[PDB]
Amino acid sequence: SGFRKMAFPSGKVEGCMVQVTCGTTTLNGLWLDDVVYCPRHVINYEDSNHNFLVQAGNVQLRVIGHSMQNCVLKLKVDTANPKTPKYKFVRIQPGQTFSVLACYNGSPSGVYQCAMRPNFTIKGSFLNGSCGSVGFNIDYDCVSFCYMHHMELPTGVHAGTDLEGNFYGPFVDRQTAQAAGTDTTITVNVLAWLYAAVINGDRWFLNRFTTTLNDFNLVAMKYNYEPLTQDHVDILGPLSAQTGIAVLDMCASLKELLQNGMNGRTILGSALLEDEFTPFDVVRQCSGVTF
Amino acid sequence: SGFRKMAFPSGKVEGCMVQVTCGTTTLNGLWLDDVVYCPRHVICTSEDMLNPNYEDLLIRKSNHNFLVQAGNVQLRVIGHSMQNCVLKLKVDTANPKTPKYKFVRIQPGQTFSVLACYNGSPSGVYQCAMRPNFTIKGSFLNGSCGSVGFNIDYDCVSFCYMHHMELPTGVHAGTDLEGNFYGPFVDRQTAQAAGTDTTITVNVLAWLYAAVINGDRWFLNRFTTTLNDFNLVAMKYNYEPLTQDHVDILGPLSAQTGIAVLDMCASLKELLQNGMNGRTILGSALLEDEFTPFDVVRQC
């Protein structure tokens, strides 16, 4: 029993964190094999090796080459990381969740779970020096790196890139007028969390009613919720079979929660509808998958 | 900017997790140097749990009855002893990944990271607090016994909790790493039941100072309170009494924001009376109590 915002174990990523210094700027880098990946803003970006100081623990790595790939700088070093895990670089979509290992001076300080918002920002917890901190998921023994932190927006939310340097969202790496778009709630994730509450014994919100997908979406649009697609309904299939509550049956519960509130009640210890757990996260946490 | 429930990086603890099997029971163990620490109930059957005589069950065991697996390697048990509710298995190999560590017993209100494990394999990490009623609101399934709670301040891991059981309300009970339970619980299938839980007042105040630091003051008021009047009101909402120690501990956050502890206490009194009126504090519609004054100073 219990339901927590759970991050993946961070050990495989901790063994890759390094400190990168170029002039007066100091930030974090990801050391995989003989390459250190970090935000290019550490340095018209196109306009020597020894100018880059890379520190792995108490050891100085020697930079023997450098190149740029989109908004990421790739520093060829003379030593391969002996702690390099099995990995892939993957680009995630809004609504997908991931763990963040927040680092300062190449030293990991904390791990937390978060989601890529529909407006492509992340509600992270980062201070100055956190640039280059990374987001990841683990599937079997392979780390899938999906995010590298680049900046904080005026509303206190965060923007970054995939590990190939492509930003998530319409953001650019530089000091200019930038803002996050109006955000929306991740509907498929709220439904997954309502199934998690039912699995944990919280059923006061269930009702005898159902709805069509079209009528539900007319309601979701009104409350700044993302449209629910047939794909989302298919993805919720296993949780629907485990609890015996049809997806459109759970949509009618959500419609009543949106139109009437919680009436002084909570769901999984929360007074707000939670959208940072995917259907896969709910299945994994209520099954015990290990790494 | 931002404020998240943050756990310590789990790597140093992942390198200590092993699987312990005794007969048909399989759970997790913590491998530090040449000793594997695990819940003593690994030697029990389900029937034994009603009234187990651990000393009688243990005397009938030899070293080779305990199977310890570290990754794909079988460790050899060369000795065993019981210390309170923990079994200590002396093994033939010292853990080369043993971090710098201490065993620390925590008090209610203290927070810690939990590395939830199954079959000696870590599956997830989360942050939580020792509740005033000595239970933890964890997320654990069958096979999670032996999962550990810890803090890492600097490069030293301070082990403070080992998971032993789930209570009928879905909450969790366990011991420090010397085998002493937190709370009036026993590693026996008995009634026991968690006592009525209360809100950790010093932690809610710390989190209100975190909201002020991050730029939000909508909840402040022009009032102050005495410590006694605050405690009289707070006890009516099932909040823990605030002591002079808690007031002293909030001193640095009070000096950083310029808001006296008893002035923040007045804002807490008013929040309990009024609710939030459709507003949130650090993205939450409830008053959060699982961040200590130390955690706020660390994260903000």
Ligand SMILES: CNC(=O)CN1Cc2ccc(Cl)cc2[C@H](C(=O)Nc2cncc3cc(Cl)ccc23)C1
């Ligand atoms: C609820 N308990 C049971 O069904 C059987 N239990 C009885 C029992 C009694 C005393 C002691 Cl010290 C340990 C145990 C065992 C126990 O509590 N382990 C579990 C630990 N954490 C989460 C658990 C979630 C689940 Cl769903 C099951 C089992 C968990 C085994």
Ligand SMILES: [Cl-]
């Ligand atoms: Cl403590």
